[PDB]
């Protein structure tokens, strides 16, 4: 409408008033996505984009939120004539979904930086005619709800978004773009992507949201950044309380990334009486294991990041090894570049810098160093093993000589007497390698003096020398 009951909480004068609105909406049949996204975008705008005049919290008046809401619903209802797309069965058709997609897409400014902060909400759509990639998918779902299309829902992989709809929720449709320089496939299914076993489509173990998970997504999408080195305390606190509200009601049960985002917020500013960040990261991993066949990479990356920030080197190495153990059962495809970048940065910047400090500290006389622990060496090896296995059978390679230099350097941070204590066992501290690259390397991993050239040859499969 809005409906009279959704209006009684206004004006919203504080973070806790916003939380009350979310709690009210979540206690309804169908939480109103359009309402909730407009409200979050309004409060983010005036807490992060333009704080001129700010004295405590940007008061969200009904009259303002209602006009924005009428702007959206009028644009959608005026442009989508439902009479042209009859619904057999309380479910939508592909043509109708495509039409809603076209409507949102065609409303967007023709040229803008698609990567800016704060263009994720319906507030940005209405006031700036700008949305980021997943923001367009969310807007399509909001628009569908506003039209009464109960069956259309958000689907999320770790780096892309689209919709599901139709008989039993079984149809997929692309509704937004992915990446840059990939021709879009808007209107099509995601079955080619699932079938090629790319990371982008998670071998089909992607999230299929209900309305409550869609609210969780908009909460994760809050962006507290004011600039490069400055976050809004107000938005961090709002995001955190909203995530706890969603947690308590059970709606983060099937959402690993949201649990990782909540753990990150708790690391930054812990809520008394709540679970530790670690407990939360592990719940993230448990959710991925329970609902998505343990096919998600970020639950382990979140955990590794925490361990890396706190210099638990052994635990960070184990969590990164576990990331590699997930990626190994994917094919590296065109459009998976975001995950290559994450692995590249870990291998080639983060781990070398961690091990460099570990080596200084060891010279200083640290006891129980990761560099003296052959289980740490084993995690390092398992990490490279899964990246090598990932590459096997993929339609493009992963490894090149730029990776070999870092490999050699990281191996050399462990003394030969530490490296020799890892037992590498065949199928069909002990480690088994899955990749042919690392199996051929086993001989080289123990020498007192690492044979650098030979390692390079083995990792890149370079056939010849100068
Ligand atoms: N070591 C280490 C490490 C590395 C990366 C890392 O990344 C955590 C952030 C993961 N990132 C996933 C994509 C995600 C997102 O960009 C996204 C998620 C799902 C589909 C599309 C986009 C947003 C979710 C809310 C709005 C979009 C933002 C969070 C953490 C630790």
Swiss-Prot record:
Changing residue 298 to A: Reduced interaction with KMT2A. It comes from the Eukaryota. Changing residue 288 to P: In MEN1; no effect on histone methylation; almost no effect on JUND-binding. Keywords: Chromatin regulator, Disease variant, DNA-binding, Nucleus, Phosphoprotein, Repressor, Transcription, Transcription regulation. One of its GO terms (molecular function) is phosphoprotein binding. GO terms for cellular component: chromatin; chromosome, telomeric region; cleavage furrow; cytoplasm; cytosol; endoplasmic reticulum lumen; histone methyltransferase complex; MLL1 complex. Changing residue 263 to Q: Yields insoluble protein; requires 2 nucleotide substitutions. InterPro entries: Menin. Ubiquitous. It is found in: Nucleus. Changing residue 267 to R: Reduced interaction with KMT2A. Changing residue 155 to P: In MEN1; loss of JUND-binding. Changing residue 345 to A: Reduced interaction with KMT2A. One of its GO terms (biological process) is positive regulation of transforming growth factor beta receptor signaling pathway. Changing residue 414 to S: In MEN1; sporadic; with Zollinger-Ellison syndrome. The keyword Isomerase does not apply. Changing residue 253 to A: In parathyroid tumor. Changing residue 135 to D: In MEN1 and parathyroid tumor. CDD domains: Menin (cd14456). Pfam families: Menin. Changing residue 264 to R: Reduced interaction with KMT2A. Its main location: nucleus. It is linked to Familial multiple endocrine neoplasia type I: Autosomal dominant disorder characterized by tumors of the parathyroid glands, gastro-intestinal endocrine tissue, the anterior pituitary and other tissues. Cutaneous lesions and nervous-tissue tumors can exist. Prognosis in MEN1 patients is related to hormonal hypersecretion by tumors, such as hypergastrinemia causing severe peptic ulcer disease (Zollinger-Ellison syndrome, ZES), primary hyperparathyroidism, and acute forms of hyperinsulinemia. This is Menin. It comes from Homo sapiens.
